[PDB]
Design a protein around this ligand. Structure first.
Ligand SMILES: Nc1ncnc2c1ncn2[C@@H]1O[C@H](COP(=O)(O)OP(=O)(O)OP(=O)(O)O)[C@@H](O)[C@H]1O
Ligand SMILES: Nc1ncnc2c1ncn2[C@@H]1O[C@H](COP(=O)(O)OP(=O)(O)OP(=O)(O)O)[C@@H](O)[C@H]1O
Ligand SMILES: [Zn+2]
Ligand SMILES: [Zn+2]
Lengths: 362, 96, 184, 145, 48
């Protein structure tokens, strides 16, 4: 019975692992189809009723079928990930733990930093009886016993690594034992190692790609409640197409520099806002009617928001939007203000962003 | 230009020794020879520590080599620094 | 220093090798404190000089601002520094570094919560899934699985991963709740 | 064929001005900058269309009230009451505008979505107007280099 | 391009002699040999 059921389970696992990438690509194609259908989605009227307009009359069942198919394919993609890519992650993690136990003694001579989630979680897997489950070297426990047993205590290393003196020696000696039955479902459950499975589940949950696929699945499910959630799956083109990755590398290569350039822009604009709020408040009227004066710099926050929103976007700086300084006793000061704003914010900082992207390319 | 200057600094430090100026290939004829030479034989930190040791040590207590280096350093003369030569070139045949 | 000098000046000598193994421990202890440079001696030959590096000097050298000073000096001497003045610039940098290191020695007078919350969330949310094994659901399902059903097998195999995904969702929710409760 | 069609319509002779690329080799050198990274340029344009579509989805779900483009109160001209109309508006009037879609859409002053819409406009300007166009610029300059 | 041309000029003058064209390494087998050769033996000003 097991001989056929386990074989069928392995068949399904192998099929999903083989077709993981094809399902990943089909999930992008289906999302692109759903969004193309959604490009024909209007508001019909109080209560707002989103209605799919269609002369053919067939696109709405198509949308429902495509949504269901996308959800199923998204679930199949996470199954394929668990079948194919997870074993590599477990192998790497187990290899790192074994080699830090051996050549570093990271759980004997030294201890994890207590802020390293990886070390604190990997503390669990050492005591498991199914360690190097994926890593080839099955003798890590014996190697660590030889290396650190005489100094830190053979017995101590034994309980640290889960090794059993009382059982190993008398099993090497003559011990009468009884094997289990594969037909026994109780024995089949007894065979599993719960602690190692807990550690594996923790590692998988902490995996980044698994989290991305879970987010994909969640967005696909939410798309049934609101069809416009299917537009979030268009963000997957970065991983789907590698030339898009090459293009986006220019932006992401100097991301820290870009963020700090944006912060510096906000600081410079805040300084200009301080100057305007202390000297040039009279010029920030933005209302044409004389009855209603709309001051955009009577308050610090309002003036700063005005400079960041209407000022940076304007091609000529804040002077394109603020009043005319003609015939005023602050005329030359305000001309200097506007020219320096245009030169530093509009010309130089944007040039810094341009140069950062071009330098990343080069 | 800034990026190119940083790359030039990295390339120079990775391809030639700071003190003697010999290329990395000659040292790498022996395995790990270049980093062995640049971290043990001709380490600039070692020269800095030697200058500190020579300054802090009493003048009467210097050995012959220390006195030689001390007098040349005091008279601002930098030929005690190896230039284009090293122990492995002085004793190339004897060493191997 | 005597043994190191002898070893380096007699590279191929088994008898000296023996004393090297006998004195490995002493050499291992004094390795950080042993300095080694090469100079052009009075005999117009390259001579190797051994001195003592102090623990305080090494620590002050390894402090980060001194490393930044070293990096800046190397950048300067490589980009605009000349070959003819390289050893003068290096000596000036060494003198300044020595003075600042001595001054620093003189003046020197004799996230975890987030990690713990994440660990707790992992443990709790995985034990929730693991409790599903001892509910005797498998014992009850034994009689119903005595008859083979391919559709039943596939449904259960999918349901396992669906439960795993639900537990991951619960883990994410618990992590967010704990992080907000912490930052509050 | 174009030369023959020029007799029926004389303005077909303007199509032969496209031959300067093969006629002059310095024009080929100049055009090599564009054609060296043509695939990258096309994919950058496609990415721009995807980002603009995402912004259109956000606007169509939350900021439809601000897309009136008619001055007369009698005739309301909604440019985002429909998905296709809103997407065409964002691609046509929005990308070309130097300040992003906020240069053309209504004022968000005194509204309960004011800060959200300010974030919308600023992010549109930063990503579409500033970054993607910078990507095109950098592609051409990198081809030259 | 202008910056690269200046860098190329500097590199060529620093790595090979103007007159004989021999590399700097051969001359630098003797300390200060390259600048000694390029300032005393094969100085272009001396030829002028
Ligand atoms: N005389 C020299 N002394 C030391 N390093 C040298 C020397 N000549 C060349 N190098 C090169 O410099 C490298 C060391 O670089 P550097 O002294 O800037 O520090 P690092 O090892 O990169 O790290 P850190 O900046 O953290 O101390 C060596 O690996 C070697 O390739
Ligand atoms: N035949 C050569 N004659 C002179 N210098 C040479 C020759 N071959 C190479 N060089 C290099 O040119 C350098 C001198 O450069 P150059 O003649 O431009 O003047 P300089 O020393 O830089 O200063 P200045 O321009 O102020 O006279 C030498 O240090 C050397 O590295
Ligand atoms: Zn050297
Ligand atoms: Zn010459």
């Amino acid at each position: 019975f097991w001989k056929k059921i386990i074989a069928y389970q392995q068949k399904l696992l192998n099929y999903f692992a083989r077709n993981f990438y094809n399902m990943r690509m089909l999930a992008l194609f289906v999302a692109f189809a759903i969004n193309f259908i959604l490009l024909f989605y209007k508001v019909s009227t109080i209560a707002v009723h989103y209605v799919l307009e269609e002369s053919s009359g067939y696109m709405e069942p198509t949308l429902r079928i495509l949504a269901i198919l996308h959800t199923v394919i998204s679930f199949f993609c996470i199954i394929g990930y668990y079948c194919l890519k997870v074993p590599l992650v477990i192998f790497k993690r187990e290899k790192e733990v074994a080699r830090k136990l051996e050549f570093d003694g990271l759980y004997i001579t030294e201890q994890p930093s207590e802020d390293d989630i990886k070390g604190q979680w990997d503390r669990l897997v050492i005591n498991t009886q199914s360690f190097p489950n994926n890593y080839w070297d099955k003798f890590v426990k014996r190697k660590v016993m030889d290396k650190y047993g005489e100094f830190y205590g053979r017995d101590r290393i034994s309980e640290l690594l889960g090794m059993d003196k009382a059982a190993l020696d008398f099993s090497d000696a003559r011990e009468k034992k009884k094997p289990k039955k594969d037909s026994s479902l109780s024995a089949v459950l007894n065979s599993i190692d719960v602690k190692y499975q807990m550690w594996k589940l923790g590692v998988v949950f902490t995996d980044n790609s698994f989290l991305y696929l879970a987010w994909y699945m969640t967005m696909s499910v939410l798309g049934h409640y609101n069809n416009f959630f299917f537009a979030a799956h268009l963000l997957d083109i970065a991983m789907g197409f590698k030339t898009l990755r090459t293009i986006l590398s220019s932006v992401t290569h100097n991301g820290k520099q870009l963020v700090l350039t944006v912060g510096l822009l906000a600081v410079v604009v805040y300084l200009y806002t301080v100057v305007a709020f202390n000297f040039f408040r009279k010029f920030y009227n933005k209302s044409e009617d004389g009855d209603t004066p709309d001051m955009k710099c009577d308050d610090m926050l309002t003036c700063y928001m005005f400079h960041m929103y209407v000022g940076v976007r304007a091609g000529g700086g804040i002077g394109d939007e603020i009043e005319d300084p003609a015939g005023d006793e602050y005329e030359i000061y305000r001309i200097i203000f506007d020219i320096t704003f245009f030169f530093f914010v509009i010309v130089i900082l944007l040039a810094i962003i341009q140069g950062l992207i071009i330098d990343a390319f080069g | 230009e800034l990026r190119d200057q940083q790359e030039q600094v990295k390339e120079d430090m990775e391809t030639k020794c700071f003190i003697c100026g010999i290329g990395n290939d000659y040292f790498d004829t022996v395995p790990h020879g270049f980093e062995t030479h640049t971290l043990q034989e001709h380490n600039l930190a070692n020269y800095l520590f030697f200058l500190m040791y020579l300054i802090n040590k009493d003048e009467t207590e210097h050995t012959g080599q220390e006195s030689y280096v001390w007098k040349m350093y005091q008279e601002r003369c930098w030929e005690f620094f190896p230039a284009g030569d090293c122990f492995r070139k002085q004793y190339e045949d004897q060493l191997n | 220093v005597l043994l190191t000098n002898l070893s380096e000046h007699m590279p191929n000598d088994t008898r000296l090798q023996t004393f090297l193994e006998l004195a490995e421990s002493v050499l291992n202890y004094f390795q950080p404190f042993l300095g080694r440079i090469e100079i052009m001696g009075s005999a117009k030959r390259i001579e190797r000089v051994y001195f003592e590096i102090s623990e305080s000097s090494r620590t002050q050298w390894e402090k980060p601002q001194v490393k930044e000073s070293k990096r800046q000096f190397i950048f300067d001497v490589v980009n605009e520094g000349g070959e003819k003045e390289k050893m003068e610039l290096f000596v000036n940098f060494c003198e300044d570094t020595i003075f600042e290191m001595q001054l620093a020695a003189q003046i020197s007078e004799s996230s975890i919560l987030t990690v713990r919350s994440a660990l707790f969330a992992l443990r709790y949310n995985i034990l929730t899934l693991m409790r599903m094994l001892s509910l005797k659901s498998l014992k009850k399902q034994m009689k119903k699985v005595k008859k083979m059903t391919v559709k039943d097998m596939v449904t259960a195999f999918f349901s396992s991963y669906w439960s795993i995904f639900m537990t991951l969702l619960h883990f994410v929710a618990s992590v967010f709740r704990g992080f907000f409760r912490i930052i509050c």
